[PDB]
C-alpha cells in the first residue's frame, strides 16, 4: 500500500503505527533516540524501576484508552514540613486548600471569553487572594507561605514556570477524567511497539527535514513519484506519500524553520510559537535507611502576591513542591526556570543541596546524606526541549486545533500531546491523537476508488 513514515516513537507515533499496521501500508517509524516511549521513560535504578517521564494514569477509568491498554497488557495491580523545621497544622493546610482550589474552580467563569479582564490564571488567583487577605482580622504569614506551595504545585501540574503565563479563558477546556504501573509505564509503549511488524521502528534515526509539496522520484528505475521526501540526519533520503509528525512542541519551537521545506503555513507556524511548553523534572534520592506517601514542603516567609510572571524564587530549591515516598527512595518534583537551572547542576551538587534542605526542613541536623541521585533533564533533551504543553497567555485552544491541522493532501499529518485540545499534556491525549491521524489516512485511502467513479 502507500508509503507512510511516522516521525517519533512516543505513544502518539506508536498508536498511529499500530492502527495503520492493523491493505497494509509500507510503514516505518523513525525514532531520534536509542529506544521508544519518548516522554514515557522508565529506568532500572536503586534495585527497582523509576519513572523519569509520565508516572500516572489520569482518570483510571473505562473511557481512558491508556487504562484500557494497561489492563489488556497485564500492567496493573489489584488496587507537611515547614522550612522552620516545625510541623504545619493539617487544619490550616485544609483551610488554605479550600480557598485555593475553590478559586481554581472559578476559572470556569472565563470559558469562551474573547477579552478577559486579566490575561492569566495567576493574575486572577492573585487578585482574589488579595481581596480575601483584606478580610483576615504571624498567622497571616503562615497562610501566605502555604498558599505559595499551592501556586508551585499548580505550576507543576500545568508544566509552567508561573500561573501568570497560563491563559485564563482556555484553562477550563482541559478535561479532567490516579495510579502507577508498578513495573514501568514504558512497559505500555514497549507492548504497542512489539505488536508492530518486525523492524517497523528504526532507532537512532533522527529526521533533519521533511520536504513536501513536491514530486520526488524514488532512487530505483523507472523512478515513481512521491509528494514527500524525508531527509534523515544520517543522509537517508526516504520518499513517502504521507508523513505523520509526532515530535514534541519544544523540538518544533526550536527547529520548525529548518525541519520543513517549504516552511509551514503561517497560522500553524504562529500556533507553534504562541503555545506554552514548560519544564517539569523529577529528582530521585536513595537513602541507606528511611528517616520518614507525600511530604509537602512549606517555605517560611514566602508569598504568591510578591511574584510576577517571570520572577524566580530566592534559591532554585524553593520551587520544589515536596517529596513522594517511592513504593529507600524519595522523588522530588520541580517545575519552571528553577527546574531548568537544576539540570545545569552536577549530580553531586543536587544530592548535597537537597541533603541540606532535608536536614533543615525535618529539623534534624544529624539526618544521614542521600546515597545516590537520579534526575530527569527534560529541558536539556535535544529531541524534546521540555516536558509538556500548556495554553499560554496569547494563545487559545484554537491553537491546539491548528497544531492538529494536516497539510494539503494529508502529505504531512500532526499528532502528539500538543495537538489534542482537551487532553493535551497527557499520555491518553497523545495516544488518541495518534489514532485520530491513522483514522484520517484510512479514510483518504478508502476514498481513492471514488476518484475513478464516473457519474454517468
Ligand atoms: C490524585 C489526583 C489528582 C491530580 N492532581 C495530582 C497532580 C498530578 C499531575 N500529573 C502530573 C503528571 C505528570 C507530571 N507526567 C509527566 C511528567 C513528565 C516529567 C513528563 C516529561 C511528561 C509527563 N506527562 C506527559 C506525557 O508523558 C506526554 O504528554 C506524552 O508521553 C507525549 O507523547 P507523544 O506526544 O507521543 O510525545 P513523545 O515526546 O513521547 O514522543 C515524541 C518522539 O519524537 C522523537 N523525536 C523528536 N524529534 C525527532 C526527530 N527529529 N526525528 C525523529 N524522532 C524525533 C522523540 O525522541 C520522541 O521519542 C504525563 N502524562 C500522563 O498522562 N501522566 C503523567 O504522570 C505525566
Ligand atoms: C478545573 C481545572 C483545572 C485544570 N488544570 C489544567 C491542567 C493542565 C493539564 N496538565 C495535566 C497534567 C499533566 C501532565
From Swiss-Prot:
Taxonomic classification: Eukaryota, Metazoa, Chordata, Craniata, Vertebrata
PANTHER family linked to this entry: FLAVIN MONOAMINE OXIDASE (PTHR10742), PEROXISOMAL N(1)-ACETYL-SPERMINE_SPERMIDINE OXIDASE (PTHR10742:SF405)
Coiled coil segments of this chain: none
Similarity section: Belongs to the flavin monoamine oxidase family.
Enzyme Commission (EC) number: 1.5.3.13
The protein, known as: Peroxisomal N(1)-acetyl-spermine/spermidine oxidase
A GO-annotated cellular component: peroxisomal matrix
Regions crossing the membrane: none
Species this chain originates from: Mus musculus
